[PDB]
UniProtKB/Swiss-Prot annotation, chain A:
It comes from Escherichia coli (strain K12). Part of the 30S ribosomal subunit; the largest protein subunit, it is loosely associated and not always found in ribosomal crystal structures. Does not bind rRNA. Probably requires ribosomal protein uS2 to associate with the 30S subunit. Binds in the junction of the head, platform and main body of the 30S subunit; the N-terminus penetrates the 30S subunit while the C-terminus faces ribosomal protein uS2. Nascent polypeptide chains cross-link this protein in situ. Can be cross-linked to mRNA in the ribosome. The lineage of its organism: Bacteria, Pseudomonadati, Pseudomonadota, Gammaproteobacteria, Enterobacterales. It comes from the Bacteria. This is Small ribosomal subunit protein bS1.
Curated annotation (Swiss-Prot), chain B:
Transmembrane segments: none annotated. Required for ribosomal protein bS1 (rpsA) to bind to the 30S subunit. One of its GO terms (cellular component) is cytosolic small ribosomal subunit. Gene3D superfamilies: Glucose-6-phosphate isomerase like protein, domain 1, Helix hairpin bin. Belongs to the universal ribosomal protein uS2 family. Part of the 30S ribosomal subunit, contacts bS1. Some nascent polypeptide chains are able to cross-link to this protein in situ. In collided ribosomes contacts ribosome rescue factor SmrB. It comes from the Bacteria. One of its GO terms (molecular function) is structural constituent of ribosome. Keywords: Ribonucleoprotein, Ribosomal protein. The modification N6-succinyllysine is found at K112. One of its GO terms (biological process) is ribosomal small subunit assembly. It comes from Escherichia coli (strain K12). Signal peptide: none annotated. This is Small ribosomal subunit protein uS2.
Swiss-Prot record, chain C:
Altered uS5 proteins have been identified in a number of mutants. Some mutations in uS5 have been shown to increase translational error frequencies. One of its GO terms (cellular component) is cytosol. Pfam families: Ribosomal_S5, Ribosomal_S5_C. With uS4 and uS12 plays an important role in translational accuracy. Many suppressors of streptomycin-dependent mutants of protein uS12 are found in this protein, some but not all of which decrease translational accuracy (ram, ribosomal ambiguity mutations). It comes from Escherichia coli (strain K12). This is Small ribosomal subunit protein uS5. Part of the 30S ribosomal subunit. Contacts proteins uS4 and uS8. With proteins uS4 and uS5 encircles the mRNA as it enters the ribosome, which may play a role in mRNA helicase processivity. Can be cross-linked to mRNA. In collided ribosomes contacts ribosome rescue factor SmrB.
UniProtKB/Swiss-Prot annotation, chain E:
The lineage of its organism: Bacteria, Pseudomonadati, Pseudomonadota, Gammaproteobacteria, Enterobacterales. It holds the Pfam family Ribosomal_S15. This is Small ribosomal subunit protein uS15. It comes from Escherichia coli (strain K12). SMART domains: Ribosomal_S15 (SM01387). NCBIfam families: S15_bact. CDD domains: Ribosomal_S15p_S13e (cd00353).
Amino acid sequence: MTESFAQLFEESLKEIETRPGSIVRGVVVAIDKDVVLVDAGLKSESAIPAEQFKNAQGELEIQVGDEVDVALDAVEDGFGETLLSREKAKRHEAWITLEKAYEDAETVTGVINGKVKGGFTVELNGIRAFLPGSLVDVRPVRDTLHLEGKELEFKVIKLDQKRNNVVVSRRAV
Amino acid sequence: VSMRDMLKAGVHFGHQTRYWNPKMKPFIFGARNKVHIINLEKTVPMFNEALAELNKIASRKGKILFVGTKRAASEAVKDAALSCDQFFVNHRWLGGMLTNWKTVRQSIKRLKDLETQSQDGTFDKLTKKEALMRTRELEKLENSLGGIKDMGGLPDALFVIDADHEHIAIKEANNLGIPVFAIVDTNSDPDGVDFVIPGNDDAIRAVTLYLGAVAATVREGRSQ
Amino acid sequence: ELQEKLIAVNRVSKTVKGGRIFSFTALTVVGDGNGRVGFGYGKAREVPAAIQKAMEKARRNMINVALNNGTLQHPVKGVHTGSRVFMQPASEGTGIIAGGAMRAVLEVAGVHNVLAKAYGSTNPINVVRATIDGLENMNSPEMVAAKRGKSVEEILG
Amino acid sequence: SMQDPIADMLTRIRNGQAANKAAVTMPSSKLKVAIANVLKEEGFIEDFKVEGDTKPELELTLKYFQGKAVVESIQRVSRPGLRIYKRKDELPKVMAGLGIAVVSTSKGVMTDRAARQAGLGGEIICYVA
Amino acid sequence: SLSTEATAKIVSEFGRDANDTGSTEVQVALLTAQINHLQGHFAEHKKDHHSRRGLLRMVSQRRKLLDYLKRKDVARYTQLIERLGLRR
RNA sequence: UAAACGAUGUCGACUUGGAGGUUGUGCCCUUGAGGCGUGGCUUCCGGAGCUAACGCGUUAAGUCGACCGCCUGGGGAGUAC
RNA sequence: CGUAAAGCGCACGCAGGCGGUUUGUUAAGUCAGAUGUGAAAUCCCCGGGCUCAACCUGGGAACUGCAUCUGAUACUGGCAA
Ligand SMILES: [Mg+2]
Ligand SMILES: [Mg+2]
Ligand SMILES: [Mg+2]
Ligand SMILES: [Mg+2]
Ligand SMILES: [Mg+2]
Ligand SMILES: [Mg+2]
Ligand SMILES: [Mg+2]
Ligand SMILES: [Mg+2]
Ligand SMILES: [Mg+2]
Ligand SMILES: [Mg+2]
Ligand SMILES: [Mg+2]
Ligand SMILES: [Mg+2]
Ligand SMILES: [Mg+2]
Ligand SMILES: [Mg+2]
Ligand SMILES: [Mg+2]
Ligand SMILES: [Mg+2]
Ligand SMILES: [Mg+2]
Ligand SMILES: [Mg+2]
Ligand SMILES: [Mg+2]
Ligand SMILES: [Mg+2]
Ligand SMILES: [Zn+2]
């Protein structure tokens, strides 16, 4: 029974799309202290650094056999290694959260990283935001020092996907 | 092994188009997404023939050297080779393991001397620090030569993972007439290999598939 | 049991800070006198050690030649670097007709009756290599019949 | 320009063997067909065929034995510049008879052995060993 | 080079039919017409050697075609050389 | 007349690849961008092969074919007549 | 014949050299056979005589050629398509 290699492999292509940026769920086979072996099943057990799998507390919230959704980078960098990274998954989830929060008009905490001529740059879950300088506060707050490094809640006004910037301000209240 | 069995493990993937050896054209089904797809229709029958020849070799008291030094598959190769009363190399292949077998014999003699000494005694005739130093030397030698420490003579066949990764061993084998069965990915050169098994050589699951088939056939030949 | 013949000994030199360091090279050929011949080349500070290294190397790296009653199967040309050698089968009684470098190789190989001549550079080290290659590519009627998918007389007769 | 199509055929054979090609294809001709026929009958090639009517393509399926080309050396002798003719008693033999010399006689193309046994001489097309 | 209309006229004049643009007669006729036209250009620009090379090329090609035509069919050759006033 | 140099005569045929450039052209994605081919010229790596090596390597210095131009120790000398 | 001596500075082009594929015909080249001739001696083979050899000598082979005649027609050439 010569069930065609073409048909059999075509079904796998139905189940596998070798394209960078595509999100595929993979199973961790082994967990090392510095690397995590995720066998998503493309060319090798991808050794994603364990630092990515640490939360804000530095703990591994994953176990042996856990499935995690990872974004595709490539197939082999000269040594046959499939490159995968949990950080890009973080990025995807953060973008989805921001996109839904704009529809929800919800407020998210963020830390003002710096200031520019047109306003300020904030950090929201690792994503850069612009806060209009004229819209930082209702009162003419001369004290620009206190508004640095503190977690303040902002609402997404204009979410920009082409420049990877999010327009935020102290709305709602 | 089954065509479905290999396809499930993903044997069919290969390296990129830009990194390939033209001599592997017959075994390449084609390309998709700028990545080569190996022909498993070539893989399965050749693997069975390799199993048959390895069965004959193992049935005539043949010595089989499992060789693969990829960091991904070294542990699997060690365990699989030990499971079948055979020999392995799981760390960096030393250039001249076969052609400089005389010097490797000197190293094996050193290993036997060290462990015989460390169990008979004379460490009580040595400063505790000298004892620890000689123990460290023994440990390093054991790591280096543990898989071949009891091989005794020239091996009767080589099984190789990633022919390109282990080309040095393939070169010594070619010079010494030792038959080489090798997992040869699309990017590697199959000329030096007597029995080329065309398939993925990275994925630990596929490596384990090949090795499990090899070990089963070897045990069949051994039991008699 | 194998017979070994030293073809040439030469002194080389390497220059270092203190001056010239003298060494020696040895070219030897071993043979079974029945169609198996190997050649070796060794280096050492002294001549006996160089010759012994050459002998050890010569015992390996040896090949088989399908002789025919002490003579070649058919005329053969060999080529290595600038040494072009020509050999042809000869009738009984001719003996070994060849230059010294080819003479030693053929004698230790067992070719009893051969006509040979070296063209171009007579450098012994390359003449030996070209002779060995020529004798190696020389095929036999049984092997050519096997290749062509016929019998011996089907080529001979 | 192209001036020896038999040389082109021989060179195609030689280069395809060197490149380990399974088969070779060339513009056909009756002389090429007869030379391929004698080569096949002497067992230096597997088989041959001709395809087409207006621009016939002749195809030779080569043969390998031990990862080696069965045809070791194929060389034109009577090149267009210098034609080489021999009499029945002057017909050369290649590799002391191990090879074959292709002869064009008054009775068609045949090997040196056949020409000698039939008492004829002719043009030495090429040597094959 | 030559305009489409003059070439069409020459083709009709010297060809068996309009589709025939490869007959030796029409080829020679086109070559002759272009040679005659270029004569003025080289009459004024005597130092235009690069173009003079192409003029020599077309002259030589016409010579070769005329030799072939003469050896293959004398009657058409005589007719053509009379009609074009050539060989003299 | 020149280191008029690629120090590589002209033309034809066969022989694994890769990364570029430049200039046409076909098909297809929803086309712009973008993906599949198919020609010309051209640069750099590199296998077989070849070479004394250096290297050349489908634009060969590989494998052959046609015709032509030269070469035969250095100096005297591209000099004397 | 890239660097050791050796590719004209480059292109066109007459004489000359070579020439895609099919059919017919020709017998020029080519091949086969035969005839004549290729002086004798010399070289070579089998023998013979000087006590051996040199030397002399019998028969033969050879003298690869040239010319003529009758044949073969694959290849090259001529002619025709
Ligand atoms: Mg050596
Ligand atoms: Mg010389
Ligand atoms: Mg024009
Ligand atoms: Mg001058
Ligand atoms: Mg000059
Ligand atoms: Mg210049
Ligand atoms: Mg320049
Ligand atoms: Mg010059
Ligand atoms: Mg020219
Ligand atoms: Mg290169
Ligand atoms: Mg002068
Ligand atoms: Mg020079
Ligand atoms: Mg030039
Ligand atoms: Mg002609
Ligand atoms: Mg013809
Ligand atoms: Mg005649
Ligand atoms: Mg006479
Ligand atoms: Mg007598
Ligand atoms: Mg006599
Ligand atoms: Mg004819
Ligand atoms: Zn690999």
